[PDB]
Amino acid sequence: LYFQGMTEYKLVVVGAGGVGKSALTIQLIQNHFVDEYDPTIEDSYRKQVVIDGETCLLDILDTAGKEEYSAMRDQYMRTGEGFLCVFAINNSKSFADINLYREQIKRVKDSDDVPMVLVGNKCDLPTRTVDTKQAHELAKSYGIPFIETSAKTRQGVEDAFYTLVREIRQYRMKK
Ligand SMILES: Nc1nc2c(ncn2[C@@H]2O[C@H](COP(=O)(O)OP(=O)(O)OP(=O)(O)O)[C@@H](O)[C@H]2O)c(=O)[nH]1
Ligand SMILES: Nc1nc2c(ncn2[C@@H]2O[C@H](COP(=O)(O)OP(=O)(O)OP(=O)(O)O)[C@@H](O)[C@H]2O)c(=O)[nH]1
Ligand SMILES: [Mg+2]
After folding, report:
1. Ligand 1 contact, 27 CB (< 6 A)
2. Cα angle: 65, vertex 96, 149; to 5 degrees
3. Residue ranges for motif Effector region?
4. How many Cα neighbours within 13 Å face the side chain of 21?
């Protein structure tokens, strides 16, 4: 649970290719928006942050959306403590891919109450095909938070990662 007395949280960002998981992560870690698309195999970042007064060590795993790197899933799902399940609000297919990740996480962790947050990214764009209410209704049925983000403008970026931390904390305080 702790590293040098700081509370450790192992966050994993998952979702289809091109949804913005790297841009989100890099916005949180480095406070800059990546405009280019450099597909990820698997990257990781640590960040010391205060969340609700608690000094946390975040270990954020930035995973592959491209199917060619699927063999790496089982390993990150075993070690991850909470999952940001990311789709893009202009990509219907990405929204339809959410439960591919969710069900795989549940299967690997053999658990129905794994901490997760649904993230609808690219909320800056005009061309929305996935509505707020539609994604909200899904997250409600899952019993998880839903947050709209823009890696470009920073809207909701902290909220997405910090909500996940709060959910893990609540899951842990239960036990
Ligand atoms: N307008 C806008 N573009 C975004 C946003 N987030 C990401 N992008 C762009 O979308 C493209 C892909 O973003 P990435 O973060 O590389 O995507 P990814 O989900 O990490 O992709 P994989 O690593 O292949 O799974 C890039 O060109 C980003 O600049 C956002 O919030 N708004
Ligand atoms: N966790 C998980 N994700 C999966 C699985 N199969 C596919 N995916 C994800 O979903 C994507 C493919 O789903 P779609 O967006 O419908 O794509 P598609 O039509 O099958 O193929 P393309 O459009 O060519 O990418 C992959 O790139 C992965 O990100 C699976 O078994 N488990
Ligand atoms: Mg990436």
Report:
1. no
2. 65
3. 37-45
4. 30
Beta strand pairing call for 54-63 and 6-14: parallel
- Give distance in angstroms: CA of 47 to centre of ligand 3: 18
CA proximity to 59, closest of 10, 19, 106, 97: 10
Distance 175 CA to ligand 3 centre (A): 33
Resolution of the structure, angstroms = 1.7
Side chain identity, residue 145: P
Instruction: Ligand 2, residue 15: give the atom nearest the CA.
Output: 29
Instruction: Please enumerate in sequence order all residues whose Cβ is within 8 A of that of 56, keeping only pairs 6 or more positions apart, or say none.
Output: 6, 7, 8, 9, 48, 49, 50, 165
Name which of 147, 118, 93 is nearest 14 in CA terms: 118
Could you give the CA distance from residue 175 to residue 173 in angstroms, rounded to a whole number? 5
Instruction: Tell me the residues surrounding ligand 3 (ion) with CB < 5 Å.
Output: 22, 40
Distances from the Cα of 24 to the Cαs of 20, 28, 140, 143, in angstroms? 6, 6, 23, 23
Q: Is beta strand 6-14 parallel, antiparallel or unpaired with respect to 82-88? A: parallel
Token duo for residue 75:
């390993």
Which atom of ligand 2 is nearest the CA belonging to 65? Answer: 29
